[PDB]
Amino acid sequence: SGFRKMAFPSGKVEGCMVQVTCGTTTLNGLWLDDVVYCPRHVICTSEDMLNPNYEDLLIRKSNHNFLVQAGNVQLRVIGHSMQNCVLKLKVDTANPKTPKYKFVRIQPGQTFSVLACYNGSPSGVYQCAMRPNFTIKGSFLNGSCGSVGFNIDYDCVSFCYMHHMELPTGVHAGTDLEGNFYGPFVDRQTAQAAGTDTTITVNVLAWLYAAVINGDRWFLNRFTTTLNDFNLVAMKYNYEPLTQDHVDILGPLSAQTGIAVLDMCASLKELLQNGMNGRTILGSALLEDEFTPFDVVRQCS
Amino acid sequence: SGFRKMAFPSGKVEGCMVQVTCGTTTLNGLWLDDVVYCPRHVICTSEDMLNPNYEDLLIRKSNHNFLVQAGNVQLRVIGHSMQNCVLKLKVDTANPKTPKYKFVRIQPGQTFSVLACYNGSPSGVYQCAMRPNFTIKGSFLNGSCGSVGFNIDYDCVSFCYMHHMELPTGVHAGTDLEGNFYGPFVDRQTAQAAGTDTTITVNVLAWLYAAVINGDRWFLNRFTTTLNDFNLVAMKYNYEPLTQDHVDILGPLSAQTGIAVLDMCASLKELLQNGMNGRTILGSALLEDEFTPFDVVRQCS
Numbered sequence: 001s002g003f004r005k006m007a008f009p010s011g012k013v014e015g016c017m018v019q020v021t022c023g024t025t026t027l028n029g030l031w032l033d034d035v036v037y038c039p040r041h042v043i044c045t046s047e048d049m050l051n052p053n054y055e056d057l058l059i060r061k062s063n064h065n066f067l068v069q070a071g072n073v074q075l076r077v078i079g080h081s082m083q084n085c086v087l088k089l090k091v092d093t094a095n096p097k098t099p100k101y102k103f104v105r106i107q108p109g110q111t112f113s114v115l116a117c118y119n120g121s122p123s124g125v126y127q128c129a130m131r132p133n134f135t136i137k138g139s140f141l142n143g144s145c146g147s148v149g150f151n152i153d154y155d156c157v158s159f160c161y162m163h164h165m166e167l168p169t170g171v172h173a174g175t176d177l178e179g180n181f182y183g184p185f186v187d188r189q190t191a192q193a194a195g196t197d198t199t200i201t202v203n204v205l206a207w208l209y210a211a212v213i214n215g216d217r218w219f220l221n222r223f224t225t226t227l228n229d230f231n232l233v234a235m236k237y238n239y240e241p242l243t244q245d246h247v248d249i250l251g252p253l254s255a256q257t258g259i260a261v262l263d264m265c266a267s268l269k270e271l272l273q274n275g276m277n278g279r280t281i282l283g284s285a286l287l288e289d290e291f292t293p294f295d296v297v298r299q300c301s
Numbered sequence: 302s303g304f305r306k307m308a309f310p311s312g313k314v315e316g317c318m319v320q321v322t323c324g325t326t327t328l329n330g331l332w333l334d335d336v337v338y339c340p341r342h343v344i345c346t347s348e349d350m351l352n353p354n355y356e357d358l359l360i361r362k363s364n365h366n367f368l369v370q371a372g373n374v375q376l377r378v379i380g381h382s383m384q385n386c387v388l389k390l391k392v393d394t395a396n397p398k399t400p401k402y403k404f405v406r407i408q409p410g411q412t413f414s415v416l417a418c419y420n421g422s423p424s425g426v427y428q429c430a431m432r433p434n435f436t437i438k439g440s441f442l443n444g445s446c447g448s449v450g451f452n453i454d455y456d457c458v459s460f461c462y463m464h465h466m467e468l469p470t471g472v473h474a475g476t477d478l479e480g481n482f483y484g485p486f487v488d489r490q491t492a493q494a495a496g497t498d499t500t501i502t503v504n505v506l507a508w509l510y511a512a513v514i515n516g517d518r519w520f521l522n523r524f525t526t527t528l529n530d531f532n533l534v535a536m537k538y539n540y541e542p543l544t545q546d547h548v549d550i551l552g553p554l555s556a557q558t559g560i561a562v563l564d565m566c567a568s569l570k571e572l573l574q575n576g577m578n579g580r581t582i583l584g585s586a587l588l589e590d591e592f593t594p595f596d597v598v599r600q601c602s
């Protein structure tokens with residue numbers, strides 16, 4: 001028993017991390033088969049980042065303009081190409097430590113592990129949720145760009161995120177591994193802010209199931225409710241609407257505890273209205289919304 | 302910026318994890334050079350749970366009673382010995398993935414990464430602290446025994462914990478890698494319970510310094526305290542005594558922020574008296590005590 005924010009084991013990804021340098025800019029690359037993926041903004045000087053023309057800046061450069069280092073070994077760059085906001089560098093050598101992998105795009109509410117990296121060196125790992133406003137609440141310093149987010153399904157690593165920038169509120173923005181931004185963001189030094197965020201309703205209910213599975217049961221009650229009724233309370237508290245798809249994904253947890261989702265929604269309803277009454281749930285004073293139903297089932301059995 | 306419960310990259314530990322079987326009992330082991338370390342209670346059977354005589358149970362085993370498995374490979378055990386509560390199994394092969402390692406016994410308040418493993422396969426990674434009552438608040442199901450806790454400071458893996466058992470209150474007890482328990486616990490199913498736990502005072506202050514570095518000042522006050530007056534107030538909230546050693550260790554964080562340790566101590570006294578009044582600190586509505594001064598400087602500016 002016990003319940004913790006838990007990252008995937010990060011070794012399959014540590015084996016793919018390289019350092020990429022172009023001029024004065026150093027950041028991280030992902031080395032899979034014979035290609036190194038990194039953010040395209042690596043080709044920009046400071047001046048360039050105010051209004052960058054990436055087509056024009058890029059056709060200027062050549063393969064030998066890119067220094068790729070896997071530990072203490074220079075990789076030879078024999079090709080370079082842009083795909084959306086991600087730069088692809090072909091190299092003479094396939095990564096002998098390439099795992100089974102695919103590129104995947106995640107939905108808001110879904111979680112992934114981030115391998116925070118500096119100068120190509122894995123530094124730390126933590127779990128994040130793609131916020132409804134398409135930011136993540138990460139921990140990144142200068143040199144972290146090109147750090148990546150991933151899930152593991154059996155032996156296959158699904159890469160879903162690459163780090164590009166920090167916003168003024170201290171939250172973070174990036175792309176999938178095909179260079180498409182999550183959220184209404186651009187890779188340029190201009191004025192950008194996160195939309196107002198909402199709470200991931202189905203994740204809070206998953207976390208309450210986790211509490212109950214772990215003998216934390218005070219918040220429970222004899223009451224039940226309806227989607228319509230709860231959703232009117234939800235919208236009032238900047239909670240995501242709860243759908244019949246969400247209720248169906250929580251089925252297993254509703255079974256394993258004998259508390260029905262609207263049974264549990266009744267508990268969440270009263271927690272938003274009344275508060276926590278000086279108590280904690282799983283050692284938090286907040287309603288935690290960064291555990292998916294999968295996360296709970298995976299960790300608890 | 303940002304601030305996250307962040308674990309060490311687990312790859313160097315992943316390539317060390319194996320499955321150990323004895324009788325009907327399977328748990329995890331740690332393969333470094335030609336030695337596999339696991340909890341000694343692997344040799345216990347159905348009746349040997351209450352008062353196992355380990356010297357008697359071990360002398361009756363040959364090397365071939367131990368079935369050790371690195372994924373698909375069956376290692377051959379060629380030797381066996383007990384050191385305190387750890388079994389040390391010699392095998393005919395050094396682990397090719399053995400990294401630079403060392404064993405260290407930690408003190409209460411110290412943090413580490415846990416690589417949770419089932420059947421020798423890594424399941425996830427998370428950060429824990431050694432509580433003042435010598436337990437950890439982990440996430441461990443049946444089969445996790447032999448999972449290890451570690452730090453990775455400057456490419457060397459310091460092993461500091463091996464998981465042995467869950468106590469009746471849902472908290473976790475284990476040994477250093479020399480097989481000596483943290484706390485007054487023993488590898489028997491006799492009734493045991495942890496001492497009253499206390500908040501890790503030095504770590505709360507380190508986290509408040511983290512909040513200030515990340516631009517939060519709302520909880521500071523114009524007051525200071527003596528170290529003695531601070532301790533008389535702090536022990537009434539079940540906080541650990543703050544020692545001169547703790548004050549010295551905060552010196553660098555004091556320096557970076559321009560806030561004296563005893564000033565920050567007055568802020569802590571006030572937060573304990575008022576609560577948060579619907580505010581949060583680094584995304585928590587509680588005072589977090591599982592980040593050390595070292596962890597705050599690692600993750601921060």
Ligand SMILES: COc1c(F)c(F)cc(C(=O)O)c1F
Nearest residue numbers: 346347348349350351352353
């Ligand atoms: C005969 O009494 C015992 C006993 F002392 C013991 F440690 C374990 C068992 C058991 O079968 O689980 C048992 F029956």
Ligand SMILES: COc1c(F)c(F)cc(C(=O)O)c1F
Nearest residue numbers: 340342446465466488489490
């Ligand atoms: C899961 O196996 C057990 C177990 F049930 C138990 F009560 C105690 C120990 C131990 O090492 O002290 C153990 F490994």
Ligand SMILES: [Cl-]
Nearest residue numbers: 052053054055
């Ligand atoms: Cl452009």
Ligand SMILES: [Cl-]
Nearest residue numbers: 406407408411
């Ligand atoms: Cl220590």
Ligand code: NA
Nearest residue numbers: 221223263266
């Ligand atoms: Na209910």
